[PDB]
Every structure is written in structure tokens, then in C-alpha cells.
């Protein structure tokens, strides 16, 4: 009860980005300021893949092909024009004006995580916690 | 109950980015300021891959192909024009005006994590924590 | 119950970026200021890969192909035109106006992490923590 | 229950960036100021790889191919035109106007980490912490 | 239960960047100011690699191919036009106007780390901490 996954045959091209002819015959790329300018993209990762346990794997692409996952923090105004306090005492948290913003990215793939906490608490912990045990052929 | 994953045959090209003809025949690249300018991209990572335990692997691309995951901090105004305090005492946290911003990137892939905390707390911990145990052929 | 993953045959080209013809026949690259200017890119990492335990591996590309993950800190104004305090005492945290910004990059790949804390707390810890145990053929 | 991963055959070219013909026949590269100007890129790292435990490895590229992960600190204005204090006492943290910015890069690959703290706290620790134990054929 | 990963055959070229013909036939490189100007790049690190435990290794490229990971510190203005203090006492931290910026690079590869702290705290520690134990054939 084992396996033998294989037996593949191709006869034509394979991932051959043959850019021919007059196409692409004149590139005029200009950049200014920050940012980037490009000319063209031909991405053809053809592949021939075999395995006997494709476990939690990815065989094409994973993350982000054309995506604007851009992040911006607070833009408003925090005005604090007076807080008459006479005498606090042992005040662990008091009188705290907090204008806070928090952003996290897309959690893509196995066992990912995006945690975003904002405000005036969150004591007693934060963040991810992962215990991974991966064994090929093993316990 | 083992395995023998293989037996692959190709006859044509393989990942051969043969850029021929008049195409690409005139590149005019200009840059100014920061940032980058490029001419063209032909990326054809064709491949022939075999394994017997493709466990938590990636065989094509993973992260980011064309992506604007750019991050900007606070842009607003924090005005603090007075806080009449007479006498605090043992004030661990008091009177704290905090204009805070926090951003994190995309967590892509296995067991990644993006934690973003912002504000006036978060004592008693922060951040990720990972215990990985990977064993090929082993326990 | 072992293995023998192999048996690959190719007959054509293999990752041969044969840039021929009139294409690319005239490059005019100009740069100014900071930043970079390039001419063209032909990246064809074709490969022939075999293994018996592809565990948490990557066999193509991983990180960032064309990406603007650029980061900017605070841009707003922090105005503090008065805080009448008569007598604090043992004030561990008090009267703190804090305009803070924090950014982190994309956490790509296995067991990565991007932590971003900003504000007026975060005592008692920060940052990642990883205990890795990898054993080939071993416990 | 061992292994023998191999048996690869190629007949054509292999990673041979044969740039022929009139293409590339006239390069005019100019630079000014800082920054860089280049002419063209033909990167074809074709390879023939075998192993018996590809554990947490990378066999193509890893980090950053074309990426603007550039970082900028604070750009706003911190105005502090008065803080009438009569008598603090044992004030560990008080009266602190702090305009702070913090950026971190992309954490790419296994067990990486990007920590970015900014503000008015973070006592009692910071930064990463890693305990790695890797054993080939061993415990 | 050992191994014998091998058996590779090539017949054509191998990483031979044969730049022939009229292409590249006229280079005109000019530089001014700082920075660099180049002519062209043909990078074809073809390779034939075998192993029996490719553990936490990299076999192609790792770090940065074309990347603007450039860093800039603060650019804003820190104005401090008065702080009427009569008598502080034992003031470990007080009256501190701090305009601070901190940047870190991309943490690429195994067990890397980029820590960036900025502000008015961070006592009681900072920075990375790593305990590595690598043993070939050993405990």
C-alpha cells in the first residue's frame, strides 16, 4: 500500500515565454518622485510536480499578485484643552486621552494570524502563539 | 509501502525566455528623484519537482508579485493646551495624552503573524511566540 | 518503505534566456537624484529538484517580486502649550504627551512575525520569541 | 527505508544566457547625483538539485527582487512652548513630550521577526529572542 | 536506511553567458556626483547540487536583487521655547522633549531580526538575543 505517482509526458513548449515579433519593440519608461515604473510582465511558471503526500503545501502562487494592501494611521485631531485634577492616588490608569490607530495585514496561508489591538487596555497579554510539530515519516 | 514518484519527460523548451525579433528593440529608461524605473520582466521559473513528503512547502512563488503594501504613520494634530494638576501621587499611568499609530505587514505563509498594538496599555506582554519542532524521518 | 524520487528527462532548452534578434538593440538608461534605473529583466530560474522530505521548504521564489512596501513615520504636529503641574510625586508615568508612530514589514515565510507597538505602555515585554528544534534524521 | 533521489537528464542548454544578435548592441548609461543606473539584467540561475531531507530550505530566490521597502522617519513638527512645573519629586517618567517614529523591515524567511516599538514606555524588555537547535543526523 | 542522491547528466551549455554578436557592441557609460553607473548584467549562476540533509540552507540567491531599502531619519522641526521649572528633585526622567526617529532593515533569512525602538523609555533591555546550537552528525 505505497505509491508511484508519476508518468508525465509533454511534447510542446514548457513555460517558454518566447516574446517575438514587433511586440515590445519600443519601451519608453519614465519615473519621477518615489514609486516604480515597469515595462511589461510575462510570468509563466509552468511546472511538473509529483509527490506522495502533498500536505499543507502550495504549488502555484500564494501571497499577492496585484494588490493595494496599503495602510494609513490616524488622520484626525486630538484636542485636550484642560483636565482639572486636584489629587489622584495610586491611579494605575486615569485621565488618559488616547487617540490611537492600529492596522494589520492580510493573514494568508496556513496558520497565519493578523491581530490588531487599539485603545486603552490590552494588559495581561497580546500577540500570537504557535506550537508547531511537523514530522516527515516521523511521530 | 514506500514510493517512487518520478517518470517525467519533456521534449520542447523549458523556461527558455527567448526574447527575439524586433520586440524590446529600443529601451528608453529614465529615472528622477527616488524610486525605480525598469524596462521589462520575463520571469519563467519552470521546474521539474519530485518528492515523497511535500509537507508545508511552497513550490512556485510565495510572497508578493505586484503589491503596494506601503505604510504611513499618524498625520493628524495632537493639541494639548493645558492640564491643571495640583498633586498626583504614585500615578503609574495618568494624564497621558497619546496620539499613536501602529501598522503591520501582511502575514503570508505558514505560521506567520502580524501583531499591531496601539494606545495606552499593553503591559504584561506583546509580540509573537513560536515553538517549532521539525523532524525529517525523526520523532 | 523508503523511496527513489527521480527519473527526469528534458530534451529542449532549460532556463536559457537567449535574448536574440534586434530586440534590446538600443538601451538608453538615465538616472538622476537618488533611486535606480534599469534596462530590462529576464529571470528564468528553471530547475530540476528532487527530495524525499521537502519539509517547510520553498523551491521557487519567496519574498517580494515587485512591491512598494515603503514606510513613513508621523507627519502631523504635536503642540504642547502648557501643563500647569504643582507637585507630582513618585509619578512613574504622568503628564506624558506622546505623538508616536510605528510600522512593521510584511512577515513572509514560515514562523515569521511582524510586531508593531506604539503608544504609552508596553512595559513588561515586547518582541518575538522563538524556540526552534530542527532535526534531520534525528529526534 | 532509505532513499536514492536522483536520475536527471538534460540535453539542451542550461542557464546559458546567450545574448546574441543586434540586441543590446548600443548601451548609453548615464548617472547623476546619488543612486544607480544599470543597463540590463539576464539572471537565469538554472540548477539541478537533489537531497534526501530538504528541511526548512530555499532553493530558488528568497528576499527581494524589485522592491521599494524604503523607510522615512518623522516629518511633523513638535512644538513645546511651556510647561509650568513647580516641584516634581521622584518623577521617573513625567512631563515628557515625545515625538517618536519607528520603522522595521519585512521579515522574510524562516523564524524572522521585525519588531517596531515607539512611544513612551517599553521598559522591562524589547527585541527578539531565539533558541535554535539544528542537528543533522543528530538528536 | 542511508542514501545516495546523485546521478545528474547535462549535455549542453551550463551557466555559459556567451555574449556574442553585435549586442553590447557600444557602451557609453557616464557618471557624475556620487552614486554609480553600470553597463549591463548577465548573472547565470547555474549549479549542480546534491546533499543528504539540506537543512535550513539556501541554494540560489538570498538577500536583495534590485531593491531600494534606503532609510531617512527625522525631517521635522523640534521647537522648545520655554519650560518654567522651579525645583525638580530626584527626577530620573522629566521635562524631556525628544524628537526621535529609528529605522531598521529587512530581516531576511533564518532567525534574523530587525528591532527598532524610538521614544522616551526602553530601559531594562533592548536588542536581539540568540543561542544557536548546530551539530552535524552530532547531538
Author numbering:
A (entry chain E), B (entry chain D), C (entry chain C), D (entry chain B), E (entry chain A): 276 to 414
Please give me the paper's original passages concerning this structure.
Proteinaceous brain inclusions containing the transactive response DNA-binding protein of 43 kDa (TDP-43) are a pathological hallmark of amyotrophic lateral sclerosis (ALS) and frontotemporal lobar degeneration (FTLD). TDP-43 consists of an N-terminal domain, two RNA recognition motifs, and a C-terminal low-complexity domain (LCD) that maps to residues ~267–414 and is rich in Gln/Asn and Gly residues. Furthermore, recent reports indicate that these aggregates can self-propagate by the prion-like mechanism. Consistent with these findings, polypeptides corresponding to TDP-43 LCD or its fragments have been shown to form amyloid fibrils in vitro.
Here, we report the cryo-EM structure of amyloid formed from the entire TDP-43 low complexity domain in vitro at pH 4. Each twisted fibril consists of a single left-handed protofilament in which subunits stack along the fibril axis with a helical rise of 4.73 Å and a helical twist of −1.66°. A near-atomic-resolution structural model could be unambiguously built for the fibril core, which maps to residues 276–414 of TDP-43. The C-terminal region (residues 344–414, strands β9–β14) is characterized by a small proportion of hydrophobic amino acids. Relatively long β-strands pack mostly via polar interfaces and many residues within strands β9, β10, β11, and β13 are engaged in steric–zipper interactions. By contrast, the N-terminal region of LCD (residues 276–343, strands β1–β8) is rich in hydrophobic amino acids and contains mostly short β-strands that are not involved in steric–zipper interactions. Instead, strands and turns pack against each other in all directions, allowing non-polar side chains to be tightly packed and buried, with a hydrophobic interface between the 311–318 and 336–341 segments. The non-planar backbone conformation of TDP-43 LCD subunits (which is not unusual among amyloids) results in rugged surfaces of fibril ends with well-defined “ridges” and “grooves”. Mapping the pathogenic mutations on the structure of wild-type TDP-43 LCD fibrils revealed that ~50% of them are not compatible with this structure due to severe steric clashes within tightly packed segments of the protein, introduction of charges into the dehydrated fibril interior, or both.
